[PDB]
Design an enzyme around this catalytic site. Structure first.
Site, PDB file in Angstrom:
ATOM      1  CG  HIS A 124      28.844   6.384 -28.096  1.00  0.00           C
ATOM      2  ND1 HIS A 124      29.527   5.573 -28.980  1.00  0.00           N
ATOM      3  CD2 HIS A 124      28.432   5.579 -27.094  1.00  0.00           C
ATOM      4  CE1 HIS A 124      29.519   4.333 -28.530  1.00  0.00           C
ATOM      5  NE2 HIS A 124      28.864   4.307 -27.384  1.00  0.00           N
ATOM      6  CB  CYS A 168      31.095   0.985 -26.446  1.00  0.00           C
ATOM      7  SG  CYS A 168      29.344   0.577 -26.649  1.00  0.00           S
ATOM      8  N   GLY A 176      28.263  -1.508 -22.317  1.00  0.00           N
ATOM      9  CA  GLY A 176      29.487  -1.271 -21.574  1.00  0.00           C
ATOM     10  C   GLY A 176      30.705  -1.794 -22.310  1.00  0.00           C
TER      11      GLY A 176
END
Lengths: 306, 306
Positions: B41, B145, B143
């Site tokens: 993503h 991730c 952030g």
């Protein structure tokens, strides 16, 4: 979101861990530049610890009596001196992995990360606090001595602790990197009294703000109070008295959540007198005091290091 | 002595953390050999997350659309492919810091260390467990991730987790390093149901043994019980049913403390029905389930890693 008891990344400290051997004793050492730091009782046997005369013991040791091994590399000891309770073994090779560092002496209530080692090799890492009575509640087995505590300020590693002993009570005592003990402890195997341990009140407040930030608000109450009247109640439950400096340190957490410091105190006051009655705060059934206001700001804003 | 929720040293993982940017999205990536791994993503904007068609989105991206920065070094992307829910950006430079690694898919109940990062830079490290419902209760801000979970087996780093999302409920979901989610979750911004969370019974037992080893024995009781009769009580309090494999895994902790597994169960059974009544175990007012029998053996014997 979420709140965890977080430790600093340890990469920069792992590369400074060496194994120090002297006679039949072997513990951890800190290799910075061209000097290895370690507890002086590395020159003591099991018998010597009962009543050691460190000067007379050190005097029967020459440079070649110390075996400093870094993984597989061997360090040649070229000098040795005793600074308070630590030894400074000057070697021939400067650690190429020496990070930007600094030696500091923290105050009770402050928090740091401990890298637990055995034989100069990392075992694990955890966050902890310096208790108001100058002890720490850690996890150390025989051989752990020489393990260091540290904080990271961007690209600079601050060494603030070096483990020296476990007390008959199961708690830990150590020194700063200059060799001065934290607390009234001496490096000898005798009964030592650690004073009364109190709860770090300013840290507990910072943790309640973290709870609010993370959705737990059930303990917020209508009441309010005064600093004097709060402190009177604090002292009955063995909490550290709160000062204005504590009030100022919490300012940012106050502005962000829209809850005044004195109002937060009123919620604490009530939890002490009434308890948590089966409820939890951030997954805990007790009042947590190992997070400083700075630790909370860090975790809640996402601060990073070199 | 002493018991702490300990995380693995992170040095070997810090050197694999890179920052991955694509368009206006920027998260963390794992640089091993000559391939960077990251949540797919990263190719999604804020709007796209509501209902993304990953194939059609990826198809409008070429190699030069990815900016992989490692500190100050820039990596040239030479290939890109989507494997399940992760991206594999093949770069030109193999990470010289690539440690001996392995990719594994753990089972609920298992524990690992998370290195929380922002912009490809380490923020902190903590130990946690994979809940029976395949979620984790961590500490992640936007952030984060791409942050990974790992275990260390001597000189080998086992990557078992990659953070992908926070659920509307505040818990976290992610994948293994092959890109398969843990649990019934999908990588999209929608309401997702995490099943009922249960307590990891085998871990709770290992923790009681740790307590005994460390001096807390007040909960040891005369009674005993059977596996069936214990499980019946377990199920009422949302505990995972215990099997024979659990009994065997605890064998070593059984031999060391001289307390039979079924007897330990009898003490647990009673704590569930009666509670801890103001008492604590290893400084805790709740039953802790984030320590596996292996984690306890490690901490109690002083295991180290490369």
């Amino acid at each position: 979101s979420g709140f965890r008891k977080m430790a600093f990344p340890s990469g920069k400290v792992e590369g400074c861990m060496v194994q120090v051997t002297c006679g039949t004793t072997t513990l951890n050492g800190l290799w910075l530049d061209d000097v290895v730091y370690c507890p002086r009782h590395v020159i003591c046997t099991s018998e010597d610890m009962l009543n050691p005369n460190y000067e007379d013991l050190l005097i029967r040791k020459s440079n070649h009596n110390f075996l400093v091994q870094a993984g597989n590399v061997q360090l040649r000891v070229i000098g040795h001196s005793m600074q308070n309770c630590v030894l400074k073994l000057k070697v021939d090779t400067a650690n190429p992995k020496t990070p930007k560092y600094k030696f500091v002496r923290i105050q009770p209530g402050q928090t740091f990360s401990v890298l637990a080692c055995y034989n100069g090799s990392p075992s694990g890492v955890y966050q902890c606090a310096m208790r108001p009575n100058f002890t720490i509640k850690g996890s150390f087995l025989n051989g752990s001595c020489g393990s260091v505590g540290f904080n990271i300020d961007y690209d600079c590693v601050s060494f603030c602790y070096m483990h020296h002993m476990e007390l008959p009570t199961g708690v830990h005592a150590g020194t700063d990197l200059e060799g001065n003990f934290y607390g009234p402890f001496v490096d000898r195997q005798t009964a030592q009294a650690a004073g009364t341990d109190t709860t770090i009140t300013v840290n507990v407040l910072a943790w309640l703000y973290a709870a609010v930030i993370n959705g737990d608000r059930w303990f917020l109450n209508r009441f309010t109070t005064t600093l004097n009247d709060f402190n009177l109640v604090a002292m009955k439950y063995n909490y550290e008295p709160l000062t204005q400096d504590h009030v100022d340190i919490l300012g940012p957490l106050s502005a962000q959540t829209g809850i005044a410091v004195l109002d937060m105190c009123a919620s604490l006051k009530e939890l002490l007198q009434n308890g948590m009655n089966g409820r939890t705060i951030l997954g805990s059934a007790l009042l947590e005091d190992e997070f400083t206001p700075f630790d909370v700001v860090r975790q809640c804003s996402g601060v990073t290091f070199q």
